[PDB]
Symmetry: C3
Subunit: 148 residues, 3 copies
């Protein structure tokens, strides 16, 4: 039950998640998500300056969890997810930070823990940008295949 | 209704004359990134938050959107082929202090809504700050657009 | 045209040994970003416009493209499966003065043309400068590729 894994992992993080999405031909295109928990943006700052690797991995986890919550609210259940085809990770960082892959692992492992080792497979790109909306540390967008 | 004439209006108000730029597959048009270039010259150059203020950046986002719409219109005759703008990626050449990427992307979004309507003009979007852009441009935007058959 | 043999010849000219990364859905292969890693080492590290000049940046873009083509060939046996490269996004680790993103991206585009032909190698493209890349790489490139099937 993916929805119950969702609840479990949100508790593990200590946060409570409760146009952003457009569907076409069985694919959901999702707007970029910063680490907002309808409170505000949780891990703001520049990775490698204000934000260390662990906090950036948490931020990526929150962005992914938010995307999953938007999916669930729109379709009722995370069972509709067939594959996360693409995940693009933009990291607000200094010019010396080289651990974009580890920040992105913060999001990928959320995918695995909620969707399984099969359905949680995804392509990904992970780059450093010089700034983000509202001084966020991470922004992530998705293309997700849906079951019909 | 008349998306082509709403386009003509925006072109007139801006005062400009609007690898492969566009490829279609399975009813989707993929569009190359567009910097704010009309004629041959790049219209709004510089770093947002330094050389380019918010209003100029919104104008740049508009010019890039206009370029993409013109490419669609040139390839299909009319903007009536547009069913939905599935995705718009906005890359903003800015300082390390600029945090108003959403307001910059609004320059593109508002054009989409005015020309196509609130239904067909719906789009997901990502808007991030980058370190530099081709030819020192201030904004670059690419699109995935669903087409009517 | 035999793309696998073109690939080998181009691999020889470049002097590197290219011999989840990929997911297919509805005839499209989505590919993860590729840094210029051949064997297990990143080949052209540094900041374009600082440590890395234009010619080396183009080489790095070539290596990333070659890596994606190799991933395609090993996953499907032959590059004959490629119908079109729908989209190529090029991220360039550069200084704030570098404005030749198009010329770097030409490094990737030309590999596609040499190996896939002027028809199948056509692609849309986006090319922006970023502040850093995994493992201090100079270029990173992702792809969306349509397949024949």
């Amino acid at each position: 039950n993916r929805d119950d894994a969702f609840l479990t992992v949100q508790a593990r993080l200590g946060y409570d998640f409760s146009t952003s999405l457009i569907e076409h031909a069985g694919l959901a295109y999702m707007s970029g998500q910063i680490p907002r928990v309808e409170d505000k943006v949780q891990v703001c700052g520049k990775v490698g300056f204000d934000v260390d690797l662990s906090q950036a991995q948490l931020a990526a986890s929150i962005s992914t969890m938010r995307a999953l919550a938007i999916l669930k609210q729109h379709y009722g259940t995370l069972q509709v997810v067939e594959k996360v085809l693409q995940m693009n990770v933009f990291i607000h960082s200094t010019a010396d930070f080289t651990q974009q892959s580890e920040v992105a692992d913060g999001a990928s492992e959320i995918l695995y823990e909620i969707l399984g080792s099969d359905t949680g497979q995804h392509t990904r790109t992970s780059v450093s940008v010089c700034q983000l909306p509202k001084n966020a540390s991470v922004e992530i967008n998705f293309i997700v295949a849906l079951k019909q």
